[PDB]
Amino acid sequence: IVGGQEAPRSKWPWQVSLRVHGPYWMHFCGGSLIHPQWVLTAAHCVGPDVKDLAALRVQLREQHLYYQDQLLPVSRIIVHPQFYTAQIGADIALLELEEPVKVSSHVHTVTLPPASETFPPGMPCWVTGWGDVDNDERLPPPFPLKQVKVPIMENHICDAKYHLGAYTGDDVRIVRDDMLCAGNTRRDSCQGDSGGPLVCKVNGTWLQAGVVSWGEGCAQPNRPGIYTRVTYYLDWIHHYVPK
Amino acid sequence: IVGGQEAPRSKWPWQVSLRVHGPYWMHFCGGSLIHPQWVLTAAHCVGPDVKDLAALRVQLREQHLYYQDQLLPVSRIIVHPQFYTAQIGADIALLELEEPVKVSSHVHTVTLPPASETFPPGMPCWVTGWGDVDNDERLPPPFPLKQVKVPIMENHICDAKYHLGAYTGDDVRIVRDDMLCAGNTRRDSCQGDSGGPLVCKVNGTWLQAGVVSWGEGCAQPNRPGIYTRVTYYLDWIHHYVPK
Amino acid sequence: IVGGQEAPRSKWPWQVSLRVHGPYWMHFCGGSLIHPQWVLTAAHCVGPDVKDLAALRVQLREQHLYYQDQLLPVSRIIVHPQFYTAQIGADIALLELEEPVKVSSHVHTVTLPPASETFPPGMPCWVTGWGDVDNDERLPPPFPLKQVKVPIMENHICDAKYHLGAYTGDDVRIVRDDMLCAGNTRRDSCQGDSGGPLVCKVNGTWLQAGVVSWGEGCAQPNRPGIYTRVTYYLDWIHHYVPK
Amino acid sequence: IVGGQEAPRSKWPWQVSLRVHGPYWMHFCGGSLIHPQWVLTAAHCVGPDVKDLAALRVQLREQHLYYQDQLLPVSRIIVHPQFYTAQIGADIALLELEEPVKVSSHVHTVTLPPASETFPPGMPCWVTGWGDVDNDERLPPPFPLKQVKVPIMENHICDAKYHLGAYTGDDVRIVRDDMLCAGNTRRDSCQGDSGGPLVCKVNGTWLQAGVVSWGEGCAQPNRPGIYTRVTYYLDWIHHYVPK
Ligand SMILES: *[C@](=O)([C]([C][C][C]1[C][C][N][C]1)[N]C(=O)O[C][C]=[C])C1=NOC([C]C2=[C][C]=C(C(=O)[N][C]3[C]C4=[C][C]=[C][C]=C4[C]3)[C]=[C]2)=N1
Ligand SMILES: *[C@](=O)([C]([C][C][C]1[C][C][N][C]1)[N]C(=O)O[C][C]=[C])C1=NOC([C]C2=[C][C]=C(C(=O)[N][C]3[C]C4=[C][C]=[C][C]=C4[C]3)[C]=[C]2)=N1
Ligand SMILES: *[C@](=O)([C]([C][C][C]1[C][C][N][C]1)[N]C(=O)O[C][C]=[C])C1=NOC([C]C2=[C][C]=C(C(=O)[N][C]3[C]C4=[C][C]=[C][C]=C4[C]3)[C]=[C]2)=N1
Ligand SMILES: *[C@](=O)([C]([C][C][C]1[C][C][N][C]1)[N]C(=O)O[C][C]=[C])C1=NOC([C]C2=[C][C]=C(C(=O)[N][C]3[C]C4=[C][C]=[C][C]=C4[C]3)[C]=[C]2)=N1
């Protein structure tokens, strides 16, 4: 997370950490608990090539990574069939936990936005995670969960921004319709935050509007963060995740 | 180049090396001379973002990288407007030299194929360059130019292989039409070769079938190398490079 | 620490972690509290060149590094004047805190040995620290304090083994007299433990016999670990630390 | 080599490069041809631990490393028996080639100074090699042989300088008697040069005064380069190398 702060221990009860087996269960991506037994994340975190479940684990809300670990096994990895690379799109996936988690005031699901919801450009949104605090510079120990308020921006203006200083023709889409963008040169998500949540408080309830996907560097000029637009894949998520 | 041998001094007179300014003029990609004032290379080597031309230099055929440098400055970088990422396509670009090159038998241009050339499986093709000799294994000094004979396979055959061991749906095209594939588990191009030529002798004439673009790793199972198909972009090329 | 286990919270109340200022206060060496205002460590951890005291802090016993930091500033760095490299010898040093620390059951000083104590082989000792768990293998987060029981061997036994497989003449002493030797191919201290303590339980009381100094690698064949012999420098220590 | 320039191909005909077997025969140290069949070098380049001759090779005077390799096998490695580490001293070794070389104007022995020679302070001397052009800064390709003119410094003065900004007591010897020193903050030898020659023109003839040994960094203030004084070991060298 770039330009942010350690998050209060009572914020973001849905933030999750994805672990991969090695010398130790190391964090490689974020995620969000959208259902007692399901984790929403980015497909490029667990694909396009098939992964071995035995090597994956899930860690729920943690103030400092690695400290109070209680890894949870994954029963299934569901990666959107239309996904190949994040720049192309469909960068969303689901993780079915082997057991439902006992939700608490400190650890519960986040709400999915209704199919009609349209997070207006400029809405107050937050992105959370243990990703780098800047380009090429890791989050220092004890690895606190960071947060930052990033302003959402219209898809067209973002697509436009990405063409500035680029050879790509103006009518060629870079930021596509199944994506959404947010952040500026001082606030953004970064390597290690992918798969994590982009939530906005609406009416008086927190809705996940995006999933940290990709972007050129972190907090770079005319290069805001790109996220998978959740509303766009609501039907695909609901084909697996109940209500 | 994976699985080749050092190339004889009399072969590949069109091979070039692109250098970027730094502690020394380092080789980052390959290229080919298609005209006394033009070089053809991969769009991802010099884009999608605009670069400082002054920081770029071109080196004509050399038996050993850095050994006998006579760097040539560049006046224009022309990247196919449809390009953004190699996996999406249009991974092609043009470099105009500030001065025309004097051709000879050791240094001359390569012949581009006729718009109808197909390069079917069983055609004799070679790929050259100063890239890695294997995944994460750089070409050791004195850095000789290497060459390797690569088997060409039909696009749909490679497309099917890229779907093996992956979540991407079978009907979701991976190896695209403006692409060409070649190589196997013992013969392939690798990192550092991008932008270089893939030439096949057709009726006593060498033709550049493709430009080294991308692949999942190098010489990996079910992951043949992918090259941008030159015949697909002849019209574009000719909008800049005279006949 | 190679070949050990996580130490229980009630053990090694004198262990300390030295921290150098940087993106975060990083651990570079161990140490021991021998007085409410003094810390004993290796001279190679802070010299032979003078350091900027401001960039150095001390962390008292922690079950896990970086998680419960309560860094303490240093006012003096006193390195034995005989020191230059660890191999030569006199690898001992003192740190004076700016304020005395409040002692308790979880954190108090270690008892220095009487001048006549030899710590003969057989007699079991332990070495503790947050160093690598093997050659080139870092202690994984959450970075627990480790401990390991190491067999003490006579100085001449170790000296003889250090000459095995070496060109150094047998009569050119390697393991010097102001040094002490312990550990084997399965139990040893490693990079990151230098400066820490080697303690042996004598008459129901724990005594610091050595200070983690050097060795050729960690837990390697015929290369037991080498520690500064604390009894050799008692007089020097008392020239600064009260009795 | 810090400071200095690429050497004319007619200079330093006795300089050699030591190669160790890996992905390619890589340069790890410099050396000098002092006899048709012998190479003088630094003990730490090939010790203290015993080495496998099969994995070692010698490359004679080359203008650009790796480009015109003609590796010569080594039959014997004689490391001075009093050597253990560069700081302690006796950092000198001998390499017996398996075949005498056919000396020429381009490649021939350097001459050893007479046991009486002293090389006064402020003497014009040159050190050469393919080592780093600066602290942590590799000599870039095409790897030209470099040279620099460095001023000899009186031993006492060097020892004195090494005590400035250090905790080592003033009467504790750092730069020992079997050592010699030269260089300043602009000119010095560096990592990659160790084992190389330090020659001075005396009475109109080139004599090797030292072997590149150690130093605190390269060209650092009050930290001149330390070399193994050759005159000091003439007797040891002549026990093997014919007069
Ligand atoms: C993320 O941090 C994002 C960055 C998001 C933008 C940066 C600034 N604005 C927002 N990802 C990123 O995708 O950028 C480029 C690609 C389109 C991130 N960090 O790392 C990645 C990529 C990645 C690294 C490592 C893994 C991994 O370990 N994967 C697998 C999963 C698995 C399960 C079981 C057993 C083994 C494995 C290995 C995955 C993805 N993106
Ligand atoms: C390439 O080596 C290729 C190899 C292609 C396949 C591998 C096996 N079968 C064939 N491919 C590759 O796709 O890399 C990954 C991304 C899609 C290659 N090497 O490096 C790249 C990418 C790349 C890295 C760094 C640079 C660079 O330095 N660029 C610029 C050029 C420039 C000019 C002036 C001033 C500054 C710069 C920076 C370029 C490309 N691909
Ligand atoms: C040690 O781990 C020891 C381990 C000892 C043996 C290995 C197996 N058996 C036991 N050994 C070691 O030999 O080190 C090298 C040579 C004598 C160790 N850890 O780290 C070091 C070396 C070292 C690294 C980094 C620093 C450092 O950062 N120092 C200073 C302190 C400081 C304070 C304030 C401002 C700046 C600084 C920089 C020091 C030493 N050895
Ligand atoms: C040297 O460059 C010296 C530098 C000289 C000073 C700099 C300014 N004043 C002079 N540096 C140095 O640090 O000296 C040693 C003591 C602290 C140098 N280059 O590399 C080294 C150390 C070194 C690196 C790599 C090897 C190596 O690979 N050795 C062997 C030889 C061998 C043969 C067969 C099979 C295996 C091997 C491994 C050795 C030494 N110092």
Side-chain angles (χ1 to χ4, degrees):
Chain A
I1 295 299
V2 191
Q5 271 151 19
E6 185 176 332
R9 20 295 113 24
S10 73
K11 294 248 187 302
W12 329 131
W14 50 75
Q15 179 63 246
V16 157
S17 169
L18 271 44
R19 304 302 180 79
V20 49
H21 178 67
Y24 68 94
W25 291 93
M26 178 178 64
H27 168 105
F28 61 100
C29 270
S32 70
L33 192 70
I34 60 168
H35 173 94
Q37 201 165 342
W38 294 82
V39 175
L40 185 63
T41 194
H44 84 265
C45 288
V46 298
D49 299 312
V50 180
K51 308 301 177 200
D52 179 359
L53 291 59
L56 183 64
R57 290 308 163 78
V58 170
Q59 174 49 59
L60 305 171
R61 183 66 170 60
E62 240 184 2
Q63 261 301 309
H64 303 87
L65 272 180
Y66 309 117
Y67 190 13
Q68 304 297 171
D69 275 16
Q70 295 187 299
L71 310 190
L72 305 174
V74 178
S75 52
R76 182 183 179 194
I77 293 170
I78 307 174
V79 176
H80 202 296
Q82 291 173 183
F83 172 77
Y84 188 53
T85 71
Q87 286 76 36
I88 290 168
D91 189 19
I92 189 168
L94 297 171
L95 301 188
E96 180 165 50
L97 299 173
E98 230 178 75
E99 292 282 40
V101 298
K102 316 298 177 58
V103 296
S104 70
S105 175
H106 186 284
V107 174
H108 60 272
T109 80
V110 67
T111 308
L112 289 182
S116 63
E117 236 134 40
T118 305
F119 306 90
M123 190 158 270
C125 307
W126 295 77
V127 63
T128 52
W130 297 276
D132 293 350
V133 301
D134 210 319
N135 291 298
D136 302 70
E137 80 176 69
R138 332 305 157 201
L139 176 60
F143 311 119
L145 174 65
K146 295 235 297 169
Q147 62 177 45
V148 58
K149 164 176 291 187
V150 296
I152 283 187
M153 297 190 87
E154 171 186 291
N155 254 53
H156 181 284
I157 252 150
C158 248
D159 182 54
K161 278 191 179 303
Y162 267 77
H163 282 76
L164 293 176
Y167 299 114
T168 309
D170 285 342
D171 296 328
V172 177
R173 305 290 239 70
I174 297 184
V175 188
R176 302 193 175 178
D177 291 300
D178 59 349
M179 302 165 182
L180 113 37
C181 80
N184 49 46
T185 49
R186 277 174 301 297
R187 307 172 179 294
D188 208 348
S189 47
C190 203
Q191 284 61 42
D193 289 321
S194 309
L198 169 62
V199 306
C200 315
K201 188 182 169 191
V202 183
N203 201 31
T205 336
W206 293 89
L207 308 174
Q208 202 182 323
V211 176
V212 176
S213 191
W214 62 283
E216 160 174 343
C218 304
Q220 304 291 53
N222 285 165
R223 300 294 189 268
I226 310 302
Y227 302 71
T228 295
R229 186 185 287 288
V230 184
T231 63
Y232 190 109
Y233 293 102
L234 242 21
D235 300 327
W236 176 84
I237 299 166
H238 287 317
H239 182 315
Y240 300 102
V241 174
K243 294 72 169 175
Chain B
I1 299 290
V2 182
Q5 33 149 178
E6 196 183 314
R9 319 190 88 292
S10 68
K11 294 182 180 305
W12 322 130
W14 47 74
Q15 180 77 219
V16 317
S17 173
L18 305 194
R19 311 289 190 71
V20 62
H21 191 55
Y24 63 95
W25 289 93
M26 181 174 60
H27 168 90
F28 63 92
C29 272
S32 54
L33 190 77
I34 53 176
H35 176 102
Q37 271 196 294
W38 299 83
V39 169
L40 179 71
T41 187
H44 80 259
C45 285
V46 300
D49 299 308
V50 181
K51 310 289 168 57
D52 186 320
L53 287 163
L56 173 69
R57 292 264 211 287
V58 174
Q59 162 63 58
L60 269 32
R61 197 205 190 294
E62 233 182 10
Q63 192 59 32
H64 293 90
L65 263 203
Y66 312 114
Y67 186 47
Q68 305 288 75
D69 288 2
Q70 306 193 304
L71 312 184
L72 299 174
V74 169
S75 62
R76 282 191 87 188
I77 291 301
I78 304 178
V79 184
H80 196 302
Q82 277 283 222
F83 173 76
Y84 190 66
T85 74
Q87 347 243 280
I88 287 182
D91 191 17
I92 203 156
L94 292 172
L95 270 41
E96 180 173 25
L97 303 183
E98 294 182 16
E99 227 61 77
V101 159
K102 269 48 200 304
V103 306
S104 61
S105 65
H106 190 70
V107 176
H108 65 264
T109 71
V110 64
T111 309
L112 291 179
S116 58
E117 198 63 57
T118 183
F119 303 110
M123 202 68 100
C125 306
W126 299 69
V127 67
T128 52
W130 292 279
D132 297 349
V133 291
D134 220 303
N135 295 291
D136 182 86
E137 199 175 304
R138 327 308 162 191
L139 178 71
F143 317 114
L145 176 67
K146 290 185 68 202
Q147 56 179 43
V148 63
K149 200 203 303 68
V150 281
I152 279 198
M153 308 177 265
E154 290 194 57
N155 276 201
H156 81 276
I157 296 293
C158 288
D159 187 50
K161 280 180 180 176
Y162 268 74
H163 284 77
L164 295 184
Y167 298 124
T168 302
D170 284 355
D171 305 328
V172 180
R173 268 280 217 301
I174 294 178
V175 180
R176 311 210 178 190
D177 307 338
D178 69 316
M179 297 175 201
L180 174 161
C181 64
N184 56 38
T185 41
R186 273 162 323 236
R187 308 170 185 294
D188 195 347
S189 49
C190 203
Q191 279 67 51
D193 287 309
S194 306
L198 192 209
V199 299
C200 314
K201 186 149 55 55
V202 179
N203 266 300
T205 302
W206 285 94
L207 306 172
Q208 204 183 316
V211 186
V212 172
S213 192
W214 64 287
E216 174 178 308
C218 305
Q220 293 299 76
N222 284 158
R223 298 292 186 266
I226 311 298
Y227 302 65
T228 131
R229 191 177 286 286
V230 180
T231 56
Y232 195 104
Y233 295 104
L234 287 173
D235 285 357
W236 178 73
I237 290 178
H238 288 149
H239 169 103
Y240 299 95
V241 189
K243 312 301 182 66
Chain C
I1 301 299
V2 176
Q5 59 194 302
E6 186 172 324
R9 288 187 172 70
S10 65
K11 297 190 81 181
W12 330 117
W14 50 71
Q15 179 75 230
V16 311
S17 164
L18 297 200
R19 304 300 185 74
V20 68
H21 188 285
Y24 65 106
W25 286 96
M26 186 174 65
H27 166 99
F28 61 96
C29 273
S32 58
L33 192 80
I34 51 175
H35 182 96
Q37 306 180 70
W38 301 86
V39 166
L40 178 69
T41 201
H44 83 252
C45 286
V46 291
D49 304 71
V50 294
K51 320 297 182 194
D52 176 355
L53 277 167
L56 167 70
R57 294 235 216 300
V58 174
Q59 167 59 47
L60 300 174
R61 194 191 191 297
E62 257 178 349
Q63 190 55 30
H64 296 91
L65 274 190
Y66 311 117
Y67 293 79
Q68 296 291 177
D69 279 11
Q70 207 77 263
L71 311 186
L72 298 173
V74 176
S75 70
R76 300 193 63 187
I77 285 171
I78 304 175
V79 184
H80 194 294
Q82 221 79 280
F83 177 83
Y84 191 61
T85 72
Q87 283 71 42
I88 294 177
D91 194 13
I92 198 168
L94 295 168
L95 300 186
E96 182 176 43
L97 306 177
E98 284 177 40
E99 308 288 355
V101 324
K102 304 305 181 176
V103 157
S104 58
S105 289
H106 193 68
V107 42
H108 66 255
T109 69
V110 62
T111 305
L112 251 37
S116 57
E117 207 71 59
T118 60
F119 301 109
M123 177 180 289
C125 310
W126 300 69
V127 57
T128 52
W130 293 275
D132 297 354
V133 292
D134 214 314
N135 302 88
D136 307 311
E137 207 174 301
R138 302 307 157 308
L139 184 73
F143 316 121
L145 175 68
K146 287 183 69 193
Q147 61 181 49
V148 68
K149 165 153 140 283
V150 287
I152 282 199
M153 317 170 23
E154 277 188 281
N155 272 206
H156 78 278
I157 297 299
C158 300
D159 185 56
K161 290 195 290 193
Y162 261 78
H163 286 77
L164 293 191
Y167 296 119
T168 306
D170 297 308
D171 282 337
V172 171
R173 193 165 300 195
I174 301 175
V175 178
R176 294 182 157 62
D177 312 329
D178 66 311
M179 300 177 182
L180 175 161
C181 177
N184 58 198
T185 59
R186 273 154 323 200
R187 299 150 166 288
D188 197 0
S189 51
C190 202
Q191 281 61 55
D193 292 305
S194 304
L198 169 48
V199 301
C200 314
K201 230 289 290 299
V202 181
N203 286 312
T205 299
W206 283 99
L207 309 174
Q208 198 183 322
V211 180
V212 181
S213 199
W214 62 290
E216 167 174 343
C218 311
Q220 296 289 290
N222 278 167
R223 298 291 182 275
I226 312 301
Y227 303 68
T228 304
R229 187 175 287 276
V230 178
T231 52
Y232 196 108
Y233 296 99
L234 287 171
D235 290 323
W236 176 74
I237 295 181
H238 291 150
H239 181 292
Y240 301 97
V241 184
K243 296 157 47 188
Chain D
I1 299 301
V2 191
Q5 280 122 44
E6 164 164 354
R9 52 164 48 62
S10 68
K11 268 149 187 43
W12 328 128
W14 51 72
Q15 175 73 238
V16 299
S17 162
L18 303 191
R19 306 298 178 68
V20 51
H21 177 68
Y24 63 93
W25 290 94
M26 182 169 63
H27 170 103
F28 60 98
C29 281
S32 61
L33 184 65
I34 53 166
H35 177 286
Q37 200 164 177
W38 296 82
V39 171
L40 181 65
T41 192
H44 82 255
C45 283
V46 296
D49 296 315
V50 176
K51 307 296 186 193
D52 182 9
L53 290 67
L56 170 65
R57 297 278 199 289
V58 184
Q59 168 57 45
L60 306 176
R61 218 283 184 189
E62 248 191 351
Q63 188 59 46
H64 299 95
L65 263 185
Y66 306 121
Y67 294 79
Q68 284 295 295
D69 280 19
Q70 282 192 69
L71 312 173
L72 313 173
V74 173
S75 48
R76 183 176 178 184
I77 298 169
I78 308 171
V79 174
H80 193 111
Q82 309 189 325
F83 172 78
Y84 186 58
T85 80
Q87 292 76 24
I88 281 160
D91 189 20
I92 188 173
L94 289 180
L95 295 191
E96 182 168 46
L97 303 181
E98 204 155 301
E99 293 283 38
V101 310
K102 310 294 182 181
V103 297
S104 62
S105 69
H106 188 74
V107 298
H108 65 272
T109 74
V110 61
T111 343
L112 300 172
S116 71
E117 194 60 48
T118 59
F119 305 113
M123 234 286 264
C125 304
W126 299 71
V127 61
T128 54
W130 295 277
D132 281 17
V133 293
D134 210 342
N135 290 297
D136 289 349
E137 194 173 309
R138 279 70 242 171
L139 177 62
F143 314 115
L145 174 60
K146 300 233 294 166
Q147 57 170 52
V148 62
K149 176 184 180 185
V150 290
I152 286 291
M153 305 269 284
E154 172 189 286
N155 246 49
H156 178 68
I157 291 298
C158 246
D159 190 55
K161 275 190 172 73
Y162 270 72
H163 279 77
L164 285 172
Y167 299 111
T168 305
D170 284 340
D171 297 320
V172 173
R173 223 82 169 309
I174 291 172
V175 185
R176 305 194 174 186
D177 290 308
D178 62 341
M179 293 169 200
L180 171 159
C181 90
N184 57 189
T185 54
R186 295 188 324 300
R187 315 171 177 300
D188 198 357
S189 38
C190 205
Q191 283 65 43
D193 295 315
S194 307
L198 171 52
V199 300
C200 317
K201 194 181 172 193
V202 190
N203 292 185
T205 297
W206 294 92
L207 306 171
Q208 206 186 313
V211 177
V212 175
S213 198
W214 61 290
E216 190 176 307
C218 307
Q220 296 305 281
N222 292 314
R223 299 291 190 270
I226 311 299
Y227 300 74
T228 295
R229 183 180 293 288
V230 178
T231 53
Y232 193 100
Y233 292 97
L234 283 167
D235 293 353
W236 179 78
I237 297 166
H238 284 319
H239 174 309
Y240 303 103
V241 174
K243 331 299 175 65

